[PDB]
């Protein structure tokens, strides 16, 4: 059978999701439990609020090689700068943040688009973090085959500073170093320490942000102006 009459979204995506371990992550694509029933709060317990992290000093640097195997459901993280990935280890689309969301598709090997539903030996997602001021995106997230969230973006921005739990800033760590922003230090969907870029599959990737409230924000990157929706809570 052919791919489609073009249909450049049903093809060009990695539809290889298996859950023999009944975690029920494809079931929660329709509904979502409360912040309590989903059992996030103990998951959220291990990362602390932005208030008491540390104080940044002097200039700014860059760092990579971080990344503790977990689910990135927190405002801080070090997404371990991205690279090419096969199409057999990805479930669902791959939204990469310009910050304006962009859906990346399967690119065969070097630069060849493919339309085999992402199931072939060579079908591969060629996503490479690079600051949009020099083209490309900041970073992006997707769910691996078995049903775990994964993320990867530009070299996770450190904030010049130290502590017992120094922050490997992935986004807009303001009031610590007044240079962090989603143009120099931003990696993933998290525009600000308390809300992500709103895209259709935001809740699925982060299933315990249900109590977040929509909001309209705008910012200029490179030579373009972006009108975007950010879903923030509390603030």
């Amino acid at each position, epitope marked *: 059978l052919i791919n489609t009459n073009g249909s450049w979204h049903i093809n060009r995506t990695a539809l290889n999701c298996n859950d023999s371990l009944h975690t029920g992550f494809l079931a929660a694509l329709f*509904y*979502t439990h*409360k912040f309590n029933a989903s059992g996030c709060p103990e998951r959220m317990a291990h990362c602390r609020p932005i208030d008491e992290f540390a104080q940044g000093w002097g200039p700014i640097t860059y760092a990579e090689g971080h990344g503790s195997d977990q689910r990135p459901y927190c405002w801080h993280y070090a997404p371990r700068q991205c690279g090419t990935i096969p199409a057999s280890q990805v479930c669902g689309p791959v939204y990469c943040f310009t910050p304006s969301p962009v859906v990346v598709g399967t690119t065969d090997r070097f630069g060849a688009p493919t339309y085999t539903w992402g199931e072939n030996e060579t079908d591969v997602l060629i996503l490479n973090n690079t600051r949009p001021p020099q083209g490309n995106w900041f970073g992006c997230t997707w769910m691996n085959s078995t049903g775990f969230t994964k993320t990867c973006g530009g070299p996770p921005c450190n904030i010049g500073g130290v502590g017992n739990n120094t922050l490997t800033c992935p986004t807009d760590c303001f009031r610590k170093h007044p240079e962090a922003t989603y143009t120099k230090c931003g990696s993933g969907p998290w525009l600000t320490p308390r809300c992500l870029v709103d895209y259709p599959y935001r809740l699925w990737h982060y299933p315990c942000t249900v109590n977040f409230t929509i909001f309209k924000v705008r910012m200029y990157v490179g030579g373009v102006e972006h009108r975007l929706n950010a879903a923030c809570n509390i603030g």
Partner: antibody
Amino acid sequence: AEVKKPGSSVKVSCEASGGTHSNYVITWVRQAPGQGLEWMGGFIPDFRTAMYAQGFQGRVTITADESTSLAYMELTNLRSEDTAVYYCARGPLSRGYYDYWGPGTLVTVS
Amino acid sequence: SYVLTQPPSVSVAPGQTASITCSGDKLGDKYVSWYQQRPGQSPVLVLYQDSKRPSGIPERFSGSNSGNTATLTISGTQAMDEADYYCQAWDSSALVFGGGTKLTV
């Protein structure tokens, strides 16, 4: 619609056009005359996955196309208990509530 | 399985308040939405996320959910608020529709 002779098939064309289309979960609901609603299944245009109702785990069969229509079911083996009005709704991705219920469709069987 | 319970019918006088209860097992942790269906019409969403309401719905409509019960409170009833109301919840990859409570003024 006329009587679909016992042991037939029926298609429910949802003519589903609501909100932002692709990123909007389709669904289906069946209401018997004066008996309240009951679920039948769901569907997602991007992830070609068709969740099934436990009571209708066998007969419900979802097939659709990329366009704003052609999304429907195929409920076979009609029986008197299947006489009802079917409504198509289009909710957001994972909020749960089914906003913008569509016009109903009556189905009868002898 | 899961079961949601609501009173069969309610009767009130004009301008007064009417309360409809949808009760279930540990329903305080399941999001509940309220539908209103007039005679021979496709339902319409009047409340979602228990308390929140969509645009185009009067502020008179109110709802809440806690413990094991969810209430739909309407203040100042009139002949234009006579219709069945249904309570909806999601449980264990299944959709549950509570019983219909006929409101008559």
